[PDB]
């Protein structure tokens, strides 16, 4: 339709939450481990178990980082979102 | 303690898929028929309208990685990723 769809506003929300947290410390367009932790704990508190160990956040960033610079840009973040969402789908029809 | 915008975003991706994948044939996958309407009805501000069969052939081809002629949810999330990334650069 002519209105922004639910899908299109969902996409915008993915963009907004990223900039909401990447803009906090250091590079405003990437998430340092500091910023990643806050995002997950405040905005994903129903899908993923809370992170309280530094060891946990270390291992996750390593797995998310495919270009190997130790931080999560938006492109890498979409992969993460894709990954998390798929898992939730599987756990609704099983 | 109340579901985030992010968490409601992820759910919405699931809902829009099922809204369209449940229509014809496999209710858990999108045939080209269903994919076209989804794009045309729900992505009419991000993607150019599809009216050519040639277009839908090509989109499904790029989207279909398991070679079944349909778009399952996993393949669809990749699509969302692709579109979303593009929208970021122009913002």
């Amino acid at each position: 339709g002519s209105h922004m769809s639910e899908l299109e506003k969902a996409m915008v929300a993915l963009i907004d939450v990223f900039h909401q947290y990447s803009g906090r410390e250091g590079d405003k367009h990437k998430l340092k481990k500091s910023e990643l932790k806050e995002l997950i704990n405040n905005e994903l508190s129903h899908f993923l178990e809370e992170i309280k160990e530094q060891e946990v956040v270390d291992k996750v960033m390593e797995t998310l980082d495919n270009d190997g610079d130790g931080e999560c840009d938006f492109q890498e973040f979409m992969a993460f979102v894709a990954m998390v969402t798929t898992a939730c789908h599987e756990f609704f029809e099983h | 303690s109340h579901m985030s915008e992010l968490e409601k975003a992820m759910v919405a991706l699931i809902d829009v898929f099922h809204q369209y994948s449940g229509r014809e044939g496999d209710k858990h996958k999108l045939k080209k028929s269903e994919l076209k309407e989804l794009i045309n009805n729900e992505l009419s501000h991000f993607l150019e309208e599809i009216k050519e069969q040639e277009v839908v052939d090509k989109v499904m081809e790029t989207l279909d990685n398991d070679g079944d002629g349909e778009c399952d949810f996993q393949e669809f999330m990749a699509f969302v990723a692709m579109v979303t990334t593009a929208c970021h650069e122009f913002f």
Binding site: - | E48, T62, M82
Partner: peptide, 19 residues
């Protein structure tokens, strides 16, 4: 406004997915 399979195909190779 607006994208196309132009730009869509343009971001299929910059990243596959470490799914």
């Amino acid at each position: 406004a607006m994208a196309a399979t132009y730009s869509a195909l343009n971001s299929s190779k910059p990243t596959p997915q470490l799914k």
